[PDB]
Amino acid sequence: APGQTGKIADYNYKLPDDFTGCVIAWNSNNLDSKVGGNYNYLYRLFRKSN
Amino acid sequence: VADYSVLYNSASFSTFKCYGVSPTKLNDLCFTNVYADSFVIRGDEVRQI
């Protein structure tokens, strides 16, 4: 959301302070639950800047 | 000297509400003193404080 910082807020993907739109979140624990541990979902860690 | 940059970095923090100032800006300002009040409460009343 515009107004948060963290691994999920800036280190991966940022929302602008003048953003207008709609975020959508829903429970995809059915398909995403992979017996293989679904480790194909990555993200950059702690980038030196924002 | 407090490493306020890295204390914020531990992902264990599930309810991190910095009413005082923004978290990343904890690094620059110089604190006159500090209160460190620690305890444990219910999982429901986490945001009653």
Curated annotation (Swiss-Prot), chain B:
Region named Integrin-binding motif? 42-44
Q: What happens upon changing residue 15 to A? A: In strain: Omicron/BA.2, Omicron/BA.2.12.1, Omicron/BA.4, Omicron/BA.5, Omicron/BQ.1.1, Omicron/XBB.1.5, Omicron/EG.5.1
What effect is documented for mutating residue 7 to I? In strain: Omicron/XBB.1.5, Omicron/EG.5.1
**What is known to happen upon mutating residue 10 to F?**
In strain: Omicron/BA.2, Omicron/BA.2.12.1, Omicron/BA.2.75, Omicron/BA.4, Omicron/BA.5, Omicron/BQ.1.1, Omicron/XBB.1.5, Omicron/EG.5.1
Tell me how this protein assembles. Binds to host ACE2. RBD also interacts with the N-linked glycan on 'Asn-90' of ACE2. Cleavage of S generates a polybasic C-terminal sequence on S1 that binds to host Neuropilin-1 (NRP1) and Neuropilin-2 (NRP2) receptors. Interacts with host integrin alpha-5/beta-1 (ITGA5:ITGB1) and with ACE2 in complex with integrin alpha-5/beta-1 (ITGA5:ITGB1). May interact via cytoplasmic c-terminus with M protein. May interact (via N-terminus) with host bilirubin and biliverdin, thereby preventing antibody binding to the SARS-CoV-2 spike NTD via an allosteric mechanism.
Physiological role: Attaches the virion to the cell membrane by interacting with host receptor, initiating the infection. The major receptor is host ACE2. When S2/S2' has been cleaved, binding to the receptor triggers direct fusion at the cell membrane. When S2/S2' has not been cleaved, binding to the receptor results in internalization of the virus by endocytosis using host TFRC and GRM2 and leading to fusion of the virion membrane with the host endosomal membrane. Alternatively, may use NRP1/NRP2 and integrin as entry receptors.
Q: What is this protein called?
A: Spike protein S1
Q: What is the lineage of its organism?
A: Viruses, Riboviria, Orthornavirae, Pisuviricota, Pisoniviricetes
Q: Which residues of the full protein are shown?
A: 362 to 410 of 1273
